[model samples]
Every structure is written in C-alpha cells, then in structure tokens.
Target: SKMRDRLFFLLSKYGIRPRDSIGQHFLIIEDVIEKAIETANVNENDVILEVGPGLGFLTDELAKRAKKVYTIEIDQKIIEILKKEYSWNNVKIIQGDAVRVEWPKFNKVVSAIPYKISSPFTFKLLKTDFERAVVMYQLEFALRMVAKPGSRNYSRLSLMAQALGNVEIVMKIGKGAFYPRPKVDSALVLIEPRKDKIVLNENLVKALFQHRRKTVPRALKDSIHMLGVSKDEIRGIINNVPHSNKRVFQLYPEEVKDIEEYLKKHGIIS
Candidate 1:
C-alpha cells in the first residue's frame, strides 16, 4: 500500500505513469535477487553493474560482495527511494538511461532488466568486456540468446554471441520471484566473452541476421556494391567466403565470423 501510494505520488509529480513499452516492473523479492548475485559470483575485486535497481534491493546485495556496485535506475521515484535509504559508500546510483550510458569495464555485471528494454539493453551489455555477466530476462528472450544455429530462435544474437563469448541460460526463475509477479517467468543468462584470435566487426554479423532469411550475398550486397569493385572482386569476395553456400540460418557462429573477416579484407566493411 505504501509503495503504491508513493509510486503514484511520484508518477503524478513527474507527469509519468509506468508504460508497458518499457516493462518497468520493480524487483522486490530478496531470495530471487540473492540467487542472481550468487550466480554472478562477484567478489571484493569486482566492480559490478546492476541495471534497473528498483528500491535498491539487489543493489544492496551486490554491494555486499562487490568492491563497488554501479546501479542505473530509470524511475525517478525509485531512484529517490534508493537515495533515501542507501548509506553505504560502495553503491553508486546513476539516475538515467542505461542504454545510453557508457559504463566502464567491470569484472562482473548483473541485472533484473526491464523486459521491454531487453533488446537494446542486452545488445549494449554484450558489447562490454567483462569476466562474467549474469542477467535476468523474460524466459523467451533468454532462449533466443542461447539458441543454437538452425533452431527457430537462432539468428544474429546467437551468431554474435558465439563470435564474442560463451552464452548460457543457467537458471529459470519464476514470475512470483518479483514484487508484482510478472505475467511471464524469467531466466538467468550467463555471458562470458571469449578472448580469442578472431578479429572482425561484430556489428556486421548482427546486421546480417536482421535479414537472416536472405542469402548472404543479398544481405551483404548493398554496401559491397557501393564500392564499384571489379567483376572479379565481387565474385572473389562472395565465392571465397563460405557465406555463398548457405542461408544465414545455416551458417555456424564461427563461420559467420570468418565471413565477417572476409568481407573486411575486400573493403566490404571494417
């Protein structure tokens, strides 16, 4: 009752109400969040990033294990509540958009992400270098992330993840785990980026899968054609890479990276 009243008052003050477009449900259950932190395995040496720390419940736990916990909260009311209750120097509260923020590299990352913002937030988070990143997402999104090639959920995310790191769906959490109890269950995603020899623009591979059903030649044809290369150059670029043999769905993650590098070499992209 108190939280509802406070949230209502704050929303009225800001001329804002929770929008379904952002999936702004707050995390209230203690054990659920504690499990998330334990999955991350953060230590005193770690600097952790916690996204959407509504009322600072998870932030408080992260602070206990991590040297410093950087939290981002979009809701002004929740940010105010955190500021009001927080006393420890280790918790840094950032009141703004997590998607736009350029977070410093940290050893560990954790969040009970706002579901509607999962795509943008997840893409942004994966770009960062970290020893481990454990995030909670709507179960469906989690499946798409860890999906293998040829699966219905498999696409660019699966491909990029393979190129960049090891992605796994470690645990399934129930909807009852949250304060409002979301309509759908959530899953914990463990992302550990690979430190390997492959060098290519991860962006291109993701862009390719946005039109995944199209043949590789068609997906990459636009930009490469812009260069006005010779007939042999065009032929060589497509023919030499394994991209010509299959649809984007048929290509393995490592194979996609190989194609990305091949494109870069011929000035298709960097």
Candidate 2:
C-alpha cells in the first residue's frame, strides 16, 4: 500500500498519467520484478539491457546484480523521471526507441516491454546476439511466441522465434501487477538462443507467413519475388514438399527447413 501510494504520489507530482497511446502500464509488484531479474539469472559479471524500464522498478533490481545496466526508454518524459529517480552508478538511462535504437553488446536482457512495440521489438531483440532474454509481454503475444507449430495462435512469430532460440514461459502476471491495470494479462518468457543456429531470411519468412493459411505453392506464388526464382523453379521447390497441400502454418519446422534447404541448393535464395 505504501509503495503504491508513493508511486502514485510521484506520478501525481510529475503530472504523469499512464499514456494509453503508448501502453504505459507501470509494473508495481516488487516480487514480480525480483522474479524477472532472477529468471534472467543475473550475476555480477553480466551486462544487462532493459527495455521500457517503466518506473525503473526492475531497473533498480538489475543494477544490484549486473556489472552494468542499460535501461532504454522511448518516452522522453519517463526518461527524465527515471534519470532523476535512479541515479545508481551502474545504471545508464537511455532515452530512445527500443525498436530503432542501436543495441549495445550485452549478454542478457530483462524487461517488461511496452505492449505496443512487442512485435517489432521482439524480432529486433532476436536479431541481436545475446545469451538469453527474460521478458514480459501481453499474454496473447507471449503465447504466440511459444505456440507450437500447428496451433491457431501459431504464427510467423512462433516460427521466427523458435528458429532463433528455445522459448519457455517462466510465469504469468495478472493485470493487477501494474499501476494502471491493463486490459490483458502478461507473461514472462525466457529465450535462450540455439548453438547450431539456422539463419532464415526474415523477408522471406514474413512473405511466406503473410499467407500462412495457404499451401506452400499458393503462398510462394504470391511471394516468390523474395526467392528470385522462375515460376517453374518455384513449382519445382513446392513439388519437393511431400505434403504440398498443407498450409504454411501446418508444416513443422523440419518441413520448412527442407523447403529452405531446397531453396538454398537451387540458389533461389541466398
């Protein structure tokens, strides 16, 4: 009660109300913040990158563990507040868009990301080389990330995320955890990149999944420009898939891999 009151008081003092346009649901639960840090397995030697450090609750905890902490905030208002509130020697509060900012080299990331930037920010985060990331996302989006190959929630996000790493749900957080309660619940997920990584062209991946419900032949017909292949060549690659009738989403990662390999072998896509 006291902590929440203090937070509300600070916001009031600064005339800072949660901006719905930005999905600014400030997390208030200390235990949840601690769990996020713990899930990341923060250590003294670690360099932590935190996204959307709303209220800097997790930022404070991360500073206590990591050798250095970088908190990226897009909103200038929040950045000014965070700079004033968290003056720890190890913490650097950066005012920039997490989606567009040049990511510094860091071993791990822990954040309760702004729900608005979840998609682009997530794919951006995955592109960067990191040991692991423990991040909180809106429940539906989180589920989509870890959703299995054939589920309804399964998507391009699932394929892209899985290809890059092993993803697992660490915990679920309710709407009540935030000061300005969100309409949807949130989940904490951990992403550990695979050692033997498969590099798929994201443009090709996006083009194919845009027609996720269609068969490979049909999907490729629309997006074959990404493959730089003739119609016959595209049909030849599609013919190689044993289950050519299966929807793009219905195909398992291995099946997709086979298609990718065939594309590579034919020099259709580099």
Candidate 3:
C-alpha cells in the first residue's frame, strides 16, 4: 500500500504518467510478469538485460533471480526515478536508447519493449550474444517473429529472428492486464539463441522483401535502388542466382542468403 503510494508520488514529481509517444503500457499484474521471468528461466547464475524498465516491475523480479540485472531506459525522467527507486545491489539503472546502448554483459534478457524500436532492437539483439530472451511484443509483430517461410506474415523479421535464435509465442495477454490500456495487444515471446547464426545484410533483406509478391528477379530490378546498382548489373547478377523465379515472399532464409552472397560476389551491395 505504502509502496504503491510512493511510486504514484514519484511520478507526480513531474507532470508525469505513461507517455504515449514511447508506447508505455505498464503490466499491472505481477503474475503476468512472474510468468515472463519464469519463461526466461532466470537463474542465480544468469545476468539479465532489461530494456525500458518502466515502473521497474519486471526489474524487481529479475534482480531477485539473476546474478545481475542491467536496465536501460531512454527517458531522462524515468532514469532519475529508477536511480532512486533501485536499491538492489544486483540492479544497475542506465540511461540511453537500448537499441543503441553499449550492451552490458548478460546471459538473459527480458522486457516489454517500446514498439517504435521493435524492428531495430530486434535486429540489434540478433547480433548480440545471449542465451535466452523473453519479450512481450504486440501480437502482429510476434506473429512476424516466428512466421514460417511461405506464410503471409513471414518477412525480413522472420528470417532475421531465426538468424540467431528461435522465437515462439509462449503466452498471450490483452490490455486489461495493463495499468493503462494499450490499443495494441500483446504476446509473450521466448527467444533462444545459438552459436549457429546467419550473417544477414539487413538492407538487402529489406530491399528484397520490399516487393513480397514480385518474383526475385523483378523484385531486385524494382528495389535495387537500395544497392544503388545499375539494372544491367542486377539483371546479370540476379539471373544467375537461385530462386530467381520464385515469389519474393516465398524465398526461404537459406535462399535469401544465396541471393545476398551472389550479389556481394557480383559487386552489388557490400
């Protein structure tokens, strides 16, 4: 009771509450958060990274289970509050854009992220080393994460998500569970990374997926501007690539890799 009162006042210290620009939808229920923590399989030996530690609800549980918890927040306002609110020896509050932050050492990561940073942040995590991560993503976005090769939801995210890890929706929740309702709903996602990760040229991936329904050659012809190459160059290069006649949406991850490799070899996108 007193604890809740303290945070309400801390928020009032500024003309503050959840900021919609950042997509702040606080999970009001500890039970939902506890499920996320358990899903991460947080262990005493693990060090966790939490992004957008808004209200510090998940951070509390993380610090209790993990050997160390590093939380990064972009807002100056929340950073100040977190600096004061956190007393746990294992928890460290940092201020920066988590997508661009100097990542701390950690084995596990968990949080409900800011939707605006979803794509870039997920791309960032693909290259970072971590054993497991659990994210509460907007449902549509979560669908894109684990989408199969030929599925309508499959895109660059599908390829990139599994580039370093395997992701699956482990739980689902709606706005009622949040302190302030979100127009978008959520799905709990578990990501388990392995050493066998593919190296992706993100821009090329986006360029090809830009024209999902187009055949690979035609898609490359139309979207080759991303590589800033001549039509003759793409024409010659793409013709020799495998899966040239397949719909762009239907190109498998390994096939995308082959196309990318062929382009790089032909002096297209570096």
Candidate 4:
C-alpha cells in the first residue's frame, strides 16, 4: 500500500509505544491529510492549531502553508521529536492533552483528532474563537453533530451545534485511512464558530432531554437541581418556559433560549 505510512518504524525509532487507550490511530494516507488542509483553506496569513501531531506527518505540511502552527502533543517523546524536526518553520509544539490545555490563538484547526477525547475536545474548542475548523471524527458522532431538531437523532449534541454554531460532514474516510486500522469508519467535518456565541445552562439542557417524549413543564418538574428554589417554587418557575404544551423534543434551540431567559429573569439559573 503506497499510501500506508511508515508509522511502525517511526514509533520504534523514537522509543514511543502507540497508546490505543487514548484512541491513537495515526493518519497513514497522505491524500486524507491533503483533504483536511484543503478543507481548512489555509491562507498564508492564517494561524492553525493541530492536536495529536504524532510523528510530525501533517505538521510538515502545515508548516509550508500557515503563518504559524501550534501542535498539541500529549506524548513527551513525540513532542520532543516534533520540536527537533519542525519547530524550524513556525511550528510550536506544546506537550499537553488537547482536552485540558489552554489553546494558543489559532485562526483555523486542522487535525485528525484523538478519538477518545472527541466529545470533550469538541466542546472545549467551541469556547475558542476560530475562523474555521476541519476535524476528523467518528462517522456516528458526525451524524449526531448534524442531526436536526425534532428528529430521532436530536439530543444535547444536536442543540449544542445548532445553538452555538454550524457543522457539516465534508467527506467520509474508510478504516484503511488510519495506521492502526480502526474498527469504525470516520468522517471529515467543517466547523464554523458562531459569531455571536450562545451559552446555555449545561445542566438544564440535560434536564430537557431526560424526558424527551414528555411535556416541557413535566421535564422541568423532573429537574430539581436546575431550579435552586424550593419544591413548589419549581412549579411556578418551570411554568415559566413559554410552551408547556410542547414536547421536549418538539422545542427548537431558540425556544430553549426563551426558557433560559425566563429562568435568568427569575434568578432560577444564570
């Protein structure tokens, strides 16, 4: 396989063990990396962030195009190799988990992300200001990212993307694209961050979905923690969400915002 990368030898040379527990599967196909860069639309003036820059494969290409590249590598040995190899060309390698580190300012993100941290990593990046992001995600998760309101797939993930910004599944990649040949297929996603960011009560959203088929008011009754007020006050406050007749699944993100606005006015939730 011409597209198959020399990752096995590279890992051996660096004395690094491939940690599959962190969902470590390196991109072996060059064309997929090319697609990620193309989807990113890397301008000469743009600064890009890449997570899990294992063995400095995609890092080399980013160096050639971007104004600056920030690579977040969790492995100590891997970061050391990247620091020696590519820091020469505007590539800054930071040794830290993608889910925990405070990211440096980056205009775009282009990475075949660590799959284990996909959910946490995604929400973390949503807090950052980025022009665009091209991320590789598990195909099933990507479907949930774009799932519509009122649809069976709709959940907190659907609302998060809908309320915060926009997401599109750009392309599909077979299991062969990765070094350790993953069990599931993957997809490339394009994320455009919301200009006017919307922050919702994380606990409240979970409460809404806890009884997806129930009425919005009934769902609120099930939520005691969301309403810091007393038991009967919960009824008075929960009655506040505009359409009590509507099912939890029937409500849109704008409608959810309306409920939060009522709670904020009553000092039920901030």
TM-scores for every predicted model: 0.83, 0.92, 0.90, 0.90
Measured by TM-score, how close is model 1 to the native structure?
Answer: 0.83
Residues 1-270, candidate 4, lDDT per residue (tens digit)? Answer: 553536776677776777636588888888888888998899799999999888778888888899999999877877777766554558888889888888899889999877788888887777678899999999998888898878887777778887787898999999998878789999999999877667787777888888788889888887764446466766776776787888888777888888888877877676
Q: What would the per-residue lDDT of candidate 3 be over residues 126-148, giving only the tens digit for each residue?
A: 78888898988888899898888
RMSD of each: 3.6, 2.2, 2.4, 2.2
Give one digit per residue, the lDDT tens place, for model 2 in 30-138: 8998898888899999999999877777888899889999888877988888778767889887888888888888999999888889999888887888999999999
Higher-ranked by lDDT: 1 or 3: 3
Model 1 stretches with alpha carbons more than 4 Å out: 1-22, 222-240
When summed lDDT is taken over every stretch of 10 residues in candidate 4, the lowest stretch is 224-233
Q: After superposition, how far is residue 153 of candidate 3 from its true place, in Å?
A: 1.7
Q: Clash number for every model?
A: 1, 0, 0, 0
User: Model 4, which residues run further than 4 Å from truth?
Assistant: 2-5, 20-22, 85-87, 196-199, 210-214, 225-229
Q: How accurate is candidate 4 locally (lDDT)?
A: 0.82
- The alpha-carbon lDDT assigned to residue 185 of candidate 3 equals 81
Candidate 3 residue 115 C-alpha distance from true site, Å? 1.2
For each candidate in the order shown, give its overall lDDT on alpha carbons. 0.74, 0.83, 0.81, 0.82
Which segments of candidate 3 are over 4 A away from where they belong? 1-10, 13-15, 20-22
